[PDB]
Design a binder for this molecule. Structure first.
Ligand SMILES: [N]C(=O)C1=[C][N+]([C]2O[C]([C]OP(=O)([O-])OP([O])(=O)O[C][C]3O[C](N4[C]=NC5=C4N=[C]N=C5[N])[C]([O])[C]3[O])[C]([O])[C]2[O])=[C][C]=C1N1=[C]C(I)=[C][N]1
Ligand SMILES: NC(=O)c1ccc[n+]([C@@H]2O[C@H](COP(=O)([O-])OP(=O)(O)OC[C@H]3O[C@@H](n4cnc5c(N)ncnc54)[C@H](O)[C@@H]3O)[C@@H](O)[C@H]2O)c1
Ligand SMILES: [Cl-]
Ligand SMILES: [Zn+2]
Ligand SMILES: [Zn+2]
Ligand SMILES: [Zn+2]
Ligand SMILES: [Zn+2]
Lengths: 374, 374
């Protein structure tokens, strides 16, 4: 019925920054060659989506955000070999074209086909598939999952287990993968090591889970919102610190707690002051600091190079180091194999139409993750 | 015989910053427990020594500098078990106490008994062994080799091959180990990779050799002194470029020549602008920039954290990641086995008394490594 036909549906369109989303009628064009048109089922709210709402992450507007989600293949374009209609899928905010220098490198995952470096708000072919009131609307990270239907490039979609509960598994689309992989793939936490995690939201907590799985002996959870400590400990944090209870700077408080500093620290928030704190609290001779939080546009850090000369390793990564099209699937399988659980991360489930309410909860600090359902 | 007695000898004293070295008679107190008094045979002139003179590295004056050396054990204090009088040895600017958190950690080498963090200008017990006209003289990195005799802690001296040519293996005491290990140990250069080395002094040329040993496919040597190019080439560089020949920033050139950037970048000069260019020239998603150059005191770098989120790795190291006491002897054995040659690095040989002429050669850019004989 719908195949090859333009689908009219509802989607949350952002026309301006610091404005609410508009649940409007938009026309979703049919998938071109090597493209897949997905029917969304569950979409989780990531702070990155909010970054555009706040102006911290610039991207052409009007836009349809969303990138953390799960859905079903409504139809595919010509040349599509990986997914067929009906297949359960997870759109990847970072592609794996498999042909660029990066994709060919065994330890890189930031494919050259991404729309993060220099945002165009289009699909890999430079064009858009969304329209609304005679106006073309921009995509976001080539996923735009805040819509009942969306078109994505084949190399940016991954087929998952047919029995996968799309309402939970949508987190593996971003939050869980990013945090967990940051600990296991990027930092490469060693068994018996000491770790520190700044920020305890959806991504932060999965970093706790990742350090735990890696065998970290001590995991120090850091957050100004005390309410997150309950979950942090439950997921594996050995202790919880709130920077506000101290008269002393956090990195100092941390170094005196761990005999000179932690082995691995992760900044999962997105502030310069906290990224400075994470670099400073990891032992000057053998510590590794992993930046996970997305920094506000055009801001810099002033660092003394002596901080690295002694032996510190400072790195960062997108998507927790997982090569998208391969990693996400295998992750779902592990979830199926009951290797881990995403239940503690989902605190609120709202109907798509109340997306604006979902962003409110994120700003009030009442929710870890909120899953908008279709 | 001089054991147990105060030795009187010549040493090069720096009384004030930015002033020539003054060759004076000093008294060298005999060694205490776990200390070794050494008779110097050959010393190399490293830019770090010059960093104190110029004022870029702060350390208490007046002082006896020098740290890349080779000599013979004159006598040992009570408790010493790792060396005996007559042994050929290399003092280590960074000790390997073997009992601290860092020494236990198999991946870090920056021992806690170092005098680089906050220089006391003493031995490990907190005292000095040099006197000059009543005035006690400060030590440097616990080694102070610009003297005919010096005393070092036992954990800062490595016993080497009895047949080692001391006028050659002194480079292994610092310059070579640092350069070669930065590539092989710290960056862990992968075979078939592309490398950029900024700075072609004795340390930077050892970084080049190390990249070649690692099997890099390309090694681009950068330096504003074209007279260094002939040696870089001979040592492994596939190409050499002079930033002054270009219209655009060196980082943009390097990225254009290597399909987006190198895989491994090395800053071996000690300047802020080059450490930045060095980070910027390694591929945003898979590059590793390694800081080897000692930056001028209290100077800060201003960086956009986004530069790291894409996948870049930024780190630094001392002594090229080698655990001093263990690594030096092994490296001397490799030298003995012809595994590598030091001849190209050693461009000048002058008697100790001509030390000022040696620093002048460095300043003019006419030398790579100048060795001083006693
Ligand atoms: N880390 C460690 O361990 C170390 C370090 N360090 C450092 O390094 C550097 C360098 O050294 P050297 O090699 O000796 O020096 P020289 O000879 O002077 O060389 C330099 C080079 O560079 C070049 N440049 C300049 N500028 C520039 C350039 N290029 C380009 N661009 C620019 N701008 C010149 O020409 C020459 O050639 C320094 O910094 C030092 O410091 C060393 C060693 C080691 N250590 C540490 C220690 I406490 C002691 N030692
Ligand atoms: N690299 C990536 O792949 C990637 C992926 C997804 C998200 N992110 C980024 O990760 C970061 C967090 O994502 P999330 O969705 O889990 O966010 P979130 O907003 O729900 O959680 C941020 C947490 O940090 C805490 N916090 C805020 N200011 C703090 C401070 N100054 N000190 C200590 N804690 C503070 C908040 O209480 C909250 O618990 C954001 O920057 C997001 O853009 C990065
Ligand atoms: Cl268009
Ligand atoms: Zn790719
Ligand atoms: Zn996300
Ligand atoms: Zn040196
Ligand atoms: Zn030690």
């Amino acid at each position: 019925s719908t195949a090859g036909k333009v689908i009219k549906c509802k989607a949350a369109v952002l026309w301006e920054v610091k404005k609410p989303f508009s649940i409007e009628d938009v026309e979703v064009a049919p998938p071109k060659a090597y493209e897949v048109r997905i029917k969304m089922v569950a979409v989780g709210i990531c702070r990155t989506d909010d970054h555009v709402v706040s102006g911290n992450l610039v991207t052409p507007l009007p836009v349809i955000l969303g990138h953390e989600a799960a859905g079903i293949v409504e139809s595919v374009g010509e040349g599509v070999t990986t997914v067929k209609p009906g297949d359960k899928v997870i759109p990847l905010f970072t592609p794996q074209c498999g042909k660029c220098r990066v994709c060919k490198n065994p330890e890189s995952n930031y494919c050259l086909k991404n729309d993060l470096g220099n945002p165009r708000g289009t699909l890999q072919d430079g064009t858009r598939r969304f329209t609304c009131r005679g106006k073309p609307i921009h995509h976001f990270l080539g996923t735009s999952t805040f819509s009942q239907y969306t078109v994505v490039d084949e190399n940016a979609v991954a087929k998952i287990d047919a029995a996968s509960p799309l309402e939970k598994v949508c987190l593996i689309g971003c939050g869980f993968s990013t945090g967990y992989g940051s600990a296991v793939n990027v930092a490469k936490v060693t068994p018996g090591s000491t770790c520190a995690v700044f920020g305890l939201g959806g991504v932060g907590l999965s970093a706790v889970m990742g350090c735990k799985a890696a065998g970290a002996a001590r995991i120090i959870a850091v957050d100004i919102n005390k309410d997150k400590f309950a979950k942090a400990k439950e997921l594996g944090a050995t202790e919880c610190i709130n920077p506000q209870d101290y008269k002393k700077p956090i990195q100092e408080v941390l170094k005196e707690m761990t005999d000179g500093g932690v082995d691995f620290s992760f900044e999962v928030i997105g502030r310069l002051d906290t990224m400075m704190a994470s670099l400073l609290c990891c032992h000057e001779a053998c510590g590794t600091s992993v930046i996970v939080g997305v920094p506000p546009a055009s801001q810099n850090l002033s660092i003394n190079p002596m901080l690295l000369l002694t032996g510190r390793t400072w790195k960062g990564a997108v998507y927790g180091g997982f090569k998208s099209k391969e990693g996400i699937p295998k992750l779902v399988a592990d979830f199926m194999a009951k290797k881990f659980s995403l239940d503690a991360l989902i605190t609120h489930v709202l109907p798509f139409e109340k997306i604006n309410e979902g962003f409110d909860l994120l700003h009030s600090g009442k929710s870890i993750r909120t899953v908008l359902t279709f």
